[PDB]
Design a protein around this ligand. Structure first.
Ligand SMILES: [Zn+2]
Ligand SMILES: [Zn+2]
Ligand SMILES: [Zn+2]
Ligand SMILES: [Zn+2]
Ligand SMILES: [Zn+2]
Lengths: 460, 66, 351, 284
């Protein structure tokens, strides 16, 4: 996961300060914070006094302080705070530009971004601008990866996606296929697709006529909620409205007809911001309108089959005939290598198969899952959850494509005292960050977690 | 606390022994090796060795499976 | 079409301070595939549940466990107020497997002498889990039946989906000649309720007996952690309590003092019995049409109550469970959960 | 995992009058209300749509305020409506304020109020079986007069705890008025593993709100800030009214008394007690 939040912090301070100016932007970014960052930052919003880290170092009780160490590295990344190496301690205070920027919005703020949209008769119906918007997303979804009908008109997105090469298709031959990114795009359920899209919109439209901060207000104007009346009319900058028009063009904005009206608050914009229920000519049966067959029996058996929905499945299994109910096929360890023929590992498929086609595997996945979590300490025999026989069937299917091993971390040396090593030996076993180690070398290639927990046990 | 880090790749030296001169053939961006089971690369250029890692492995092998 | 007790004759003396040592069978009978793993393993699964719940609903009681293997009975847990020792015992017993046959009389007498140190106030009772159709008795059972009833220890047992007349007689014989205590199972949930009804105290009509007052005190928590030191176990305790009389640093335990031997309790266990002592009458389901009350729940906000002349949907019923004393309604989900968990009738609570 | 903050706030005009009476009338619980609402909005703004509920207990009844059972039939545009809808309830309850409202001072419907919301919460918990919320409630007390320590309602209070402990939910409580440090609340919030504080009336407590009530929902990774000790030397001798530390239970009645009882027929149940047991007790 590219973790757009990492890009969010990636932007420098002044542009963050440029984004810190808008309380609505200050507001939206808050929900990204962990509850540590969420609650604790709220405190310094009010008591106007920089607090040295020693108080906060003292605030957290036993295990959970690593999140503070996670938090401090996190907040430095987006520079929401201002560290002060004043008195040998770390005299931490907020970045009020954001801190006081949101502080106004806390008690009925004057954040024009929050008030840019006009509350009016939000006449956008359930199916209206959602069925089309979902159909737009579905239509481009079929077109982008390659569906029976490619009705997606996002040429600029296609130019951006083709230029970004995220859709691994031969643009010279006009191919629009799911490459490593495109197949990885299948991994992104709802937001993830929009995230790379949001990144693609950011990456594509980010240099020429950027005005991103102004667009960001429009972005978070879309990100905030449904515009209702006067949205496009009033709350729309040149980039913001154009981006809103661009966002409205892609269906992610369910703008009213004629492209000139108040903001039509389609569900699409909220959903990527939501991370919640992902539910979207005149007939539509769901969720089980699309379904397939995947179980411990290792076979495909469909009684629903939605051509775009089943188009995803057929890329890693041979298909014989799309029945009225069925997509006739049988999964084989070679069949999954059809994805590996593209190089797509059946690794996203692990969760995906437990996620997708479940409309036809509600009973089977539930019989697989069997709620075997509370009984796990008591009963030690799991019921194929998640299917290890399939995993075994999957794992040795990869035997065709072999010979890769590497690991992430950092080189660690200059270690002298074994007591602490022995102390950390169990303490690392207590904290469980061990990819691999060896006392023969006292050297390992892992993250920086072990030092910080040793740092803040009894020091100050 | 100064760290002599690098783009560590841990494996057996077998195809790495190939990779050594092969790196010198592919301009050798695998920089540092404290011990034989290790390879450190240049972050802007890590994957180019791993490019032909596929290419050399697939050029003619092609899985005949008679 | 209702399955309810006509009335609940609770109002008075029940089995509150209890000394129950339930006896299990560990035989080839419990090995058979009557339940999905088997009888025993599912039973051990089932039996585990009641232990804490017994200590939950009746923390004022003490309990040990005895099994019966290969024509011999074996105690497997000490009569104690802590679930954990009992709880951890079953884990080994879970990994242990039933064998041979049960010896009823061995359990009869091993438990019989086991309950001898029990005080009068602590009510002696035994429950049996039996799977076979015959016993293994070293002597006259009726003599032991005579001995037990002479000890004035009523007993309820639950055999499998069958009947044993002497066991039917025994539950009769133990319980003042009143046979309502040889109920047997026919289903696992029907078995589950057996646990559910077991936690309840046992009022029927207690003969006018010597009733004893009780004196004790509350414990006082220890605060320091670094001062870790224990006396009831000669350990180091990073936090404990203090006896009201002996004033000993005692770990967290609602049990009796270990020095001057007095019960230590704060408040919680006491009021557990209270709602048991004086429960409520079931919230009467008010009629579909003869009620004509507010179209909402009372404890909760369930605006839907029927279906309003919707053919049979409204003629079905009206979720209008109304407590009689408060004369206030309640949705079935609310009302059942009320009587399930917290009696506390807000309509009766409000006055 | 979001949270369900369900404020169970007493509304006694005498307590509100006491809130004006204690200290001065330099701002009533309206100032407290002013602090609450913006602080209340922080809850939903904190977590991913963490819901709430509001119920108040007047001297002769109780009622939901936020939940808004079917009656008709800015800040993200959600706080505006929810609070304003709630705003009307209190002003509707402002209409619900007259001598009859001032009459039933003998009755205390708060006892039912504390219990009643939990069922609704459990009912909410029941319907919210999917995506279980790590919830916790809040209760507030305007330190009132004419009743130093109401005890008739204390017995049901104990019952709520066992359910509440079973319900697995901490509770925050703050007393605002005369410094009658309610051991009940001191015990109860400690029993329910919460917090009790006796703050003053006219202080601006949003910082107190936002700080002292930002702990329970799901995290609890921080050193707790409990009030003074939570000793459990329990209720007074019911016959005497004086606290007993060496417990003295009458019988199955469980009457809590001192060394007082005559050995027969405690003043909580008509049960003559064994003289021989009393004589054995009198052996000291
Ligand atoms: Zn101890
Ligand atoms: Zn003692
Ligand atoms: Zn209800
Ligand atoms: Zn009632
Ligand atoms: Zn009594």
């Amino acid at each position: 996961k590219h973790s757009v939040t990492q890009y969010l912090e990636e932007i420098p301070q002044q542009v963050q300060n440029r984004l810190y100016t808008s309380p609505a932007t200050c507001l939206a970014i808050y929900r990204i914070l962990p509850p540590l960052a969420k609650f604790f930052i709220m405190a310094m919003v009010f008591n106007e006094n920089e607090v040295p880290l020693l108080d906060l170092d003292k605030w957290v009780n036993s295990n959970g302080k690593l999140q503070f160490q996670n938090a401090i590295k996190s907040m430095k990344s987006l520079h929401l705070l201002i560290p002060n190496k004043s008195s040998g301690t770390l005299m931490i205070n907020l970045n009020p530009t954001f801190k006081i920027s949101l502080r106004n919005a806390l008690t009925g703020g004057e954040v024009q971004n929050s008030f840019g949209v006009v509350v009016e008769e939000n006449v956008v119906s359930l199916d209206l601008l959602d069925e089309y918007s979902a159909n737009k997303w579905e239509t481009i979804l079929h077109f982008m990866v390659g569906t029976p009908l490619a009705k997606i008109p996002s040429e600029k997105v296609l130019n951006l996606l083709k230029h970004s090469k995220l859709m691994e298709e031969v643009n010279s031959t006009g191919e629009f296929k799911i490459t490593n990114e495109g197949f990885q795009f299948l991994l992104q359920e709802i937001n993830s697709q929009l995230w790379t899209l949001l990144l693609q919109y950011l990456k594509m439209i980010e240099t020429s006529k950027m005005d991103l901060v102004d667009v960001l207000h429009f972005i978070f104007m879309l990100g905030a909620l449904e515009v209702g009346k006067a949205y496009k009319i009033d709350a729309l900058s040149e980039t913001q409205r154009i981006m809103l028009q661009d966002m409205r063009d892609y269906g992610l904005v369910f703008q009213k007809h004629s492209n000139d009206s108040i903001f039509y608050p389609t569900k699409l914009a909220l959903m990527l911001t939501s991370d919640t229920k992902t539910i979207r000519g005149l007939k539509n049966q769901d969720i089980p309108d699309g379904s397939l067959i995947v179980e411990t029996n290792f076979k495909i058996y469909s009684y629903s089959n939605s051509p775009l929905q089943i188009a995803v499945l057929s890329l890693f299994v041979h298909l014989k005939a799309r029945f009225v109910n069925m997509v006739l096929g049988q999964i084989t360890r070679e069949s999954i290598r059809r994805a590996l023929t593209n190089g797509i590992t059946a690794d996203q498929i692990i969760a995906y198969l437990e996620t997708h086609a479940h409309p036809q595997m509600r009973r089977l996945a539930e019989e697989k899952l069997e709620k075997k979590l509370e009984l796990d300490p008591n009963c030690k025999e799991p019921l194929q959850v998640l299917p290890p026989t399939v995993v075994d069937q999957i794992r040795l299917w990869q035997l065709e494509l072999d010979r890769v091993i590497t690991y992430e971390g950092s080189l660690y040396s200059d270690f002298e005292t074994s007591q602490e090593y022995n102390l950390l030996s169990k303490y690392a076993q207590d904290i469980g960050v061990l990819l691999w180690k060896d006392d023969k070398k006292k050297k390992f290639f892992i993250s920086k977690e072990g030092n910080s927990q040793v740092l803040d046990f009894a020091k100050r | 606390a100064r760290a002599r880090k690098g783009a560590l790749v841990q494996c057996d030296p077998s195809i790495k022994a190939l990779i050594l001169q092969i790196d010198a053939k592919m301009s050798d961006i695998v920089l540092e090796e404290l011990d034989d089971t290790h390879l450190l690369v240049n972050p802007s250029k890590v994957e180019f060795v791993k490019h032909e890692l596929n290419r050399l492995l697939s050029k003619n092998i092609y899985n005949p499976m008679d | 079409k209702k399955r309810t007790a006509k009335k609940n004759i609770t109002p008075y003396q029940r089995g509150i301070i209890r000394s129950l040592i339930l006896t299990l069978d560990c035989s080839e009978a419990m090995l058979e595939k009557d339940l999905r793993p088997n009888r025993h393993a599912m039973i051990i699964q089932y039996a585990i549940d009641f232990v804490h719940e017994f200590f939950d609903q009746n923390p004022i009681s003490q309990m040990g466990i005895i099994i019966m293997r290969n024509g011999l009975a074996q105690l497997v847990s000490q009569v104690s107020g802590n679930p954990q020792d009992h709880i951890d015992a079953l884990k080994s017993i879970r990994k242990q497997e039933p064998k041979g046959n049960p010896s009823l009389q061995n359990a009869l007498e091993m438990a019989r002498g086991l309950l001898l140190p029990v005080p009068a106030h602590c009510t002696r009772e035994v429950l049996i889990v039996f799977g076979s159709l015959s016993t293994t008795d070293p002597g006259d059972i009726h003599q032991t039946i005579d001995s037990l009833v002479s000890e004035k220890i009523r007993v309820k047992v639950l055999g499998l989906s069958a009947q044993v007349a002497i066991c039917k007689e025994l539950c009769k014989a133990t319980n003042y000649g009143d046979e309502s205590f040889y109920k047997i199972l026919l289903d696992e949930t029907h078995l589950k309720e057996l646990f559910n009804e077991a936690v309840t105290p046992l009022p029927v009509n207690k003969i006018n007996k010597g009733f004893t007052l009780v004196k004790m005190g509350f414990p006082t928590r220890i605060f320091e952690d670094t001062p870790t030191f224990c006396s009831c176990h000669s350990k180091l305790v990073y936090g404990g309590y203090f006896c009201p009389n002996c004033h000993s640093k005692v770990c967290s335990l609602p049990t009796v003092c270990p020095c001057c031997d007095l019960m230590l309790i704060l408040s919680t266990h006491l009021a557990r019995s209270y709602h048991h002592l004086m429960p409520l009458k079931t919230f009467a389901e008010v009629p579909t049409t003869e009620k004509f009350r507010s179209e909402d729940c009372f404890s909760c906000q369930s605006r839907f109550p029927x279906x309003x002349x919707x053919x049979x949907x409204x003629x079905x019923x009206x979720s209008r469970y109304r407590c009689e004393d408060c004369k206030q309604e309640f949705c079935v989900d609310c009302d059942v959960f009320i009587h399930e968990i917290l009696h506390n009738c807000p309509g009766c609570e409000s006055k | 995992s979001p949270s369900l903050l369900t404020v169970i706030i007493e509304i006694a005009p005498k307590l509100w009058t006491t809130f004006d009476e204690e200290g001065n009338e330099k701002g009533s619980i309206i100032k407290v209300l002013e602090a609450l609402i913006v602080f209340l909005n922080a809850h939903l703004a904190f977590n991913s749509a963490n819901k709430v509920a509001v119920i108040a207990a007047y001297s002769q009844g109780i009622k939901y305020l936020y939940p808004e059972s079917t009656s008709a039939l800015x800040x993200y545009r959600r706080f505006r409506n929810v609070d304003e809808t709630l705003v009307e309830e209190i002003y509707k309850l402002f209409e619900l304020e007259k001598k009859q409202i001032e009459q039933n001072s003998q009755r205390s419907t708060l006892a039912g109020a504390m219990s009643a919301g939990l069922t609704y919460v459990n009912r909410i918990s029941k319907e919210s079986v999917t995506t279980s919320l790590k919830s916790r409630l809040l209760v507030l007390t305007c330190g009132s007069g004419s009743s130093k320590d109401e005890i008739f309602q204390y017995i049901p209070i104990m019952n709520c705890i066992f359910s509440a402990t079973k319900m697995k939910c901490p509770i925050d409580v703050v007393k605002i008025g005369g410094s009658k440090e309610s051991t009940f609340l001191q015990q109860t919030t400690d029993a329910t593993n919460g917090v009790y504080l006796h703050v003053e009336s006219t202080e601006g407590l949003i910082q107190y709100l936002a700080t002292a009530m930002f702990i329970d929902p799901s995290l609890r990774p921080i050193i707790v800030k409990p009030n003074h000790g939570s000793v459990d030397f329990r209720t007074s001798c019911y016959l005497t009214g004086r606290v007993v530390a060496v417990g003295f239970i009458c019988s199955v009645c469980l009457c809590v008394l001192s060394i007082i009882p005559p050995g027969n027929k405690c003043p909580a149940c008509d049960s003559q007690f064994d003289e021989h047991v009393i004589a054995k007790l009198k052996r000291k």
